[PDB]
A paper describes a structure:
To next gain structural insight into Mm GS we utilized cryo-electron microscopy (Cryo-EM). These experiments, performed with apo Mm GS at ~20 μM, revealed that 14% of the sample was captured in a partially oligomerized form with the remaining particles adopting a dodecameric state; particles corresponding to monomers/dimers were not processed due to their small sizes. The fully oligomerized Mm GS structure, which was resolved to 3.0 Å resolution, is composed of a dodecamer with stacked hexamer rings. Similar to these GS structures, each Mm GS subunit is composed of 15 β-strands and 15 α-helices and each subunit is divided into a larger C-domain and an N-domain by helix α3. As expected, structural homology searches showed that Mm GS subunits display the strongest similarity to subunits of Gram-positive bacterial GS structures, with root mean squared deviations (rmsds) of 0.5–1.0 Å for 430 similar Cα atoms compared to the Bs GS, Lm GS, Sa GS and Pp GS18. By contrast, the hexamer interfaces differ in structure and sequence in a region corresponding to Mm GS residues 165–169. For these experiments we compared samples of apo Mm GS and apo Bs GS at concentrations of 75 nM. These experiments showed that 97% of the apo Mm GS was present as dimers with no dodecamers present.
The enzyme, [name] (GS; EC 6.3.1.2, L-glutamate: ammonia ligase) plays a central role in cellular nitrogen assimilation by incorporating ammonium into glutamine, which serves as a carbon and nitrogen donor for the biosynthesis of nucleotides, amino acids and lipids. Here we describe a structural dissection of the archaeal [name] (Mm) GS and its regulation. Like the Gram-positive GS, the Mm GS active sites are formed at the interface between two subunits in the hexamer and are comprised of five regions; the E flap (Mm residues 303–310), the Y loop (residues 369–377), the N loop (residues 235–247), the Y179 loop (residues 152–161) and the D50 ´ loop (residues 56-71), which is the only active site region contributed from the adjacent subunit.
Author numbering:
A (entry chain B): 215 to 447
B (entry chain A), C (entry chain V): 5 to 447
The structure:
Amino acid sequence: VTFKYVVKSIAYHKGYYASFMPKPLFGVNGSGMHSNQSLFKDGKNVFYDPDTPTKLSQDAMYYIGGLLKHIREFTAVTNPVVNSYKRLVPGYEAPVYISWSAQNRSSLIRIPATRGNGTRIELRCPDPACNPYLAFALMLRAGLEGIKNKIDPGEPTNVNIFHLSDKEREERGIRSLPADLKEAIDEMKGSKFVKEALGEHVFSHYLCAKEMEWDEYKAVVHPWELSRYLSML
Amino acid sequence: KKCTTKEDVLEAVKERDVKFIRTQFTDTLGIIKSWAIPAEQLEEAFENGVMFDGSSIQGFTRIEESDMKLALDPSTFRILPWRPATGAVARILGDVYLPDGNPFKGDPRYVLKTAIKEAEKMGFSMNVGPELEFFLFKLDANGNPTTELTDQGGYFDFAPLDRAQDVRRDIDYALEHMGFQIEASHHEVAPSQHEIDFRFGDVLCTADNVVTFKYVVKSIAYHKGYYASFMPKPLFGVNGSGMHSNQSLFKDGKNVFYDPDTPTKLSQDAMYYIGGLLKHIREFTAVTNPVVNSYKRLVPGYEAPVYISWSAQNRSSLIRIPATRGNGTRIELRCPDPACNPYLAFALMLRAGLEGIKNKIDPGEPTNVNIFHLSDKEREERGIRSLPADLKEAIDEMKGSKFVKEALGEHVFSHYLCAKEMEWDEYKAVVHPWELSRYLSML
Amino acid sequence: KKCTTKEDVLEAVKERDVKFIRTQFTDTLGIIKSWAIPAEQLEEAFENGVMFDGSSIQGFTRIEESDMKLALDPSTFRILPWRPATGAVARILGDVYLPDGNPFKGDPRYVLKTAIKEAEKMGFSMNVGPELEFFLFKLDANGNPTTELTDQGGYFDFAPLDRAQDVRRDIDYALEHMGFQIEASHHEVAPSQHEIDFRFGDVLCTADNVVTFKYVVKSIAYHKGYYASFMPKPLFGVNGSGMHSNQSLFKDGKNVFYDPDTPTKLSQDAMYYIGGLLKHIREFTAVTNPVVNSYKRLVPGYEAPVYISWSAQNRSSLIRIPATRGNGTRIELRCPDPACNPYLAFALMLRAGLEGIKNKIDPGEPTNVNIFHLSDKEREERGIRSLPADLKEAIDEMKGSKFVKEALGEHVFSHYLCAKEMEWDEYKAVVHPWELSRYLSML
Ligand SMILES: [Mg+2]
Ligand SMILES: [Mg+2]
């Protein structure tokens, strides 16, 4: 939170402007906020396991399993503005499919090759417009639920998902993130886990604010429509 | 002084109050890549190295992120020649290692190191002194680069004399302040074109200096209001910018090329070395001339060579032997341009020359006449080959070259071709304004 | 009506009050050449012919004046479709003769006539109906041609509907007034692109009509405030303009391609005719695509074919056989563009086709799949060749083809190559603005 307004203030006094929009320009990569995370018990990392072929503990598998199960529900928190879903489109570094991998980078959850005390898990969905307090809290709560319930994360996806076909994705059972803000709200609105974690007061207030914001956006006539339709029709 | 140990590097940072350390490395295509490190992190970085996204090395054709570790080299530490009010700034180089500990074979620096090691097997070491040429244009009101000239001077002219003169002097002083030990600097044939010459040194050290030289000059021009460009041919009708490479092989501390007993004062090895270069120069021309614009410079009518020949007095030859003898004996190759990757270019030059020495390749009779003034029948009669006309032709030659793939390694070979192939395909489908001015009214 | 004799031509001139007569002929490179003659001189011209500078036929590579005599052909008389206040205007064609009386072999029209005689020796005659495509741009304030679109319509769209609609209708009416017998006219895929289909008629008459068609349309557009362009690719990212050619061979008044007893309703001769075209198409590609801009259109991803194949249902194939059968059986070649010379293009197409029939060349299996979707290994496995990538490559192919030299004659062959060679050399040394946008800042 401090970093955001410190950078913005410096740019003004030097004559420039720093922006945190998830996608300010079309045709170029967007701005994201990946979140490396690790869990420590008794002063030691719990993800690292020297006795496993992947050097990852059983808890780390469950932690990833919990994240994958619930990531669809609280996607609105990690991507809170309408512009956030212009970044989540196929063809860039942004992930739009729910998968985890070790060597692939297009996966939603990436495990860096670093091991030992530096073992970490990277989630690539959030963008800087998100609220760090809410995003991290849900990210922690989702992982713990997976550990508590021993959710199996399934097989990793080492292939390029974007190159696969829809039948292949259907055969492999690969889900996708919500396409737009309205779809995300519908998912997050029936999720009892999100409501329990965020509390009743924050849950209701967050939904109403986003709901009003989407309704205003859905009724605007963008200049792109005029260029394509004014002369044709 | 010269810093050799990490303790010396740390002492210098504390002494001169360096706040930021910038790594330095180049991708496959020759672009300079770097990132910043706070001064406090330096001590830990020396002990364990830095983890970074190494997919940037593979160019702009990267698909998947891959992690590998960079280990800093204290012997390459140096301080950039500008003093911000905050504090001093310094740069450093290093080696790239995969997580399993094996060195990454896709690093252009590693390619040159293997070539040096190959020469060491035969007991040779090479010294390179390159001649870099660049332009100095004006900036628009928005600070974007333009092609506005700064003076209409000529060859070796005492130009410029306006405030741009101070800008040129600042570049020379800054390079000297870094310890490059420049030999000479002068105006070039084209307007607003300048040339800077380097002293001989170890090829690895020279290659690093060339990379550092490029962004040092560019940074100075911006802060003075000008722009320095390294395009092989930014303007039509004037000479282009090239990077000639004077080179020599040293064995047992003495020059191999020099031979007092021969009439030309050149050793038998030098003849073989030239023969090896002539045989293979056509194959790796794409490396020395990587961009499309490089072949707008390789056209007849200027100092740029377009025919494969060597001479002692003629200048139009691709390979020229300067009249200097003794320890100064050298061989100058005039094909490369500043847009080339110095690591890849020098490595291929060394490997190609060594192969000629091993195989006793005869360079043939030198051409002491003007090849351009000759006719096609004469060139066919004399068997004078020509360099590839366009980037696509160069790629086709390079692609089937077994020797090039062996020298550069499989990973670099495949990645380099794909990046160039995509670049050419984009260019070939454009409708340039020259066509409109010629065909719109006619047809 | 139809004018046959010089007496009929003179009677028509007096009756309709034609004040000026314009000769019409084309040079080697396809430019339209003409000069004016007063109506009174017409009677003398028919008696003895007109002396004129014959060095204009050799293109812009002319060096020395040379005199040849043009003998007017009364059967080609026609009246231009505009009515100046002073009086009517008419055009006429004729043959070129050397002073000693021998016909001039450098005339593109004479090249086609020789090809017809060669076909007539086998008893065949050809009918050709081409499909010409062109753009319609706006003029600037100074009347110079530009490239602003007049509408954003699509394929077969009912566009334009503004005042440009009347201009489009005027072109159709003027051509009909000439007696062109237009088949159909419609909008094309690219914005402001239109296509006109000619009536399926005799090859010699068609070639003259195509030449007449070009300047008739251009003149109309100017007087209405617009500009008509025939560039093979005036805009990037949209379809180019091509001139597909449908041809058929007739013997004894019957089509020879149609065979009711075959599964494909195609005769054995038609298979050989296609086989001859496929074998030699690479050699004379420069004739069908004579300008540099032509090869910007020949890129994958559009309607233009870039692979040598023939098919019955596919469209990307170079040679397409329409589903029509019987007397209307025809073969469509999709490589040519409107910038080509109709006389040279048709003559080579005839000579190549006959050579296949004479030698019984097998056309091979048709390609019914999308070639662009296949891989390079598949194309290599299937043995699918590709058209020349750029004008320089086409010249190299066409410069060694002995068949092209034999068909076009020594004089036309040498002159055509030199003119194209000089044009390419000028283009290859230009620094296009696209290079500056990509390389000025990066390097
Ligand atoms: Mg020089
Ligand atoms: Mg069409």
